Amino acid sequence: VARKLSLLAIIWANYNYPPKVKGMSPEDKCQALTTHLLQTVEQIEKTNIRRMIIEPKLTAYPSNLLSRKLLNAIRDSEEGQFLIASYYN
């Protein structure tokens, strides 16, 4: 989530200078978290912009690439093949 937040700060580095993060713990990404609300001020429908900052979408998976199960479920399912064909036709 710190990587994503630093990406977001980088995107809007023109409007405001991003603070240093060098030599800093993974928990202290809260400074970047705080400054992105400041950057959000400078432009429309900010609700979605702020939501990705304060409440980042995240989905932890105990298993490891998991992908094979999804592939098998897609191939076995009739609809799944129907949906793929509909998308690509």
XYZ file of C-alpha atoms in Angstrom:
89
model
C 0.000 0.000 0.000
C 2.991 2.307 0.513
C 4.099 1.557 -3.058
C 0.637 2.459 -4.337
C 0.577 5.640 -2.240
C 4.016 6.681 -3.510
C 2.819 6.066 -7.077
C -0.177 8.310 -6.412
C 2.059 11.024 -4.944
C 4.338 10.747 -7.979
C 1.387 11.277 -10.329
C 0.569 14.627 -8.685
C 4.138 15.698 -7.893
C 3.733 18.753 -10.142
C 1.038 20.344 -7.969
C 2.852 19.739 -4.674
C 6.337 18.554 -3.772
C 6.231 15.008 -2.325
C 7.989 14.522 1.023
C 11.041 12.327 1.465
C 10.508 8.651 2.291
C 14.153 7.564 2.119
C 15.448 5.622 5.114
C 11.980 5.251 6.602
C 9.934 2.366 7.986
C 7.074 0.724 6.049
C 4.699 1.952 8.785
C 5.674 5.616 8.381
C 3.943 5.746 4.987
C 1.332 7.660 6.999
C 3.152 10.895 6.076
C 2.500 10.137 2.390
C -1.049 9.151 3.346
C -1.515 12.550 5.000
C -0.042 14.598 2.157
C -2.212 13.019 -0.479
C -5.272 14.652 1.086
C -3.371 17.945 0.772
C -2.620 17.178 -2.889
C -6.279 16.238 -3.442
C -7.259 19.858 -2.734
C -5.488 21.082 -5.876
C -9.936 18.433 -8.971
C -13.531 17.249 -9.457
C -15.489 14.350 -7.915
C -12.765 13.958 -5.253
C -14.732 11.247 -3.412
C -13.260 8.473 -5.568
C -9.793 10.050 -5.360
C -9.843 10.147 -1.558
C -11.427 6.696 -1.211
C -8.468 5.021 -2.924
C -6.198 6.795 -0.415
C -7.845 6.424 2.996
C -9.466 3.055 2.159
C -7.183 1.356 -0.333
C -8.664 -1.678 -2.064
C -6.668 -4.679 -0.900
C -7.384 -8.459 -1.097
C -5.030 -10.800 0.760
C -4.827 -14.407 -0.438
C -3.381 -17.090 1.885
C -2.540 -19.392 -1.032
C 0.132 -18.667 -3.641
C 0.043 -18.162 -7.391
C -4.537 -20.206 -6.917
C -4.469 -19.215 -10.582
C -4.844 -22.877 -11.563
C -8.089 -23.195 -9.593
C -9.513 -20.123 -11.339
C -8.444 -21.431 -14.747
C -10.035 -24.827 -14.089
C -13.249 -23.187 -12.877
C -13.401 -21.026 -16.011
C -12.709 -23.895 -18.422
C -15.124 -26.351 -16.791
C -18.004 -23.832 -16.567
C -20.180 -23.674 -19.700
C -21.250 -20.063 -19.092
C -17.595 -19.142 -18.581
C -16.730 -20.225 -22.115
C -19.924 -18.588 -23.382
C -18.961 -15.305 -21.696
C -15.414 -15.434 -23.074
C -16.709 -16.069 -26.595
C -19.246 -13.250 -26.234
C -16.513 -10.866 -25.083
C -14.237 -11.799 -27.982
C -17.001 -11.805 -30.618
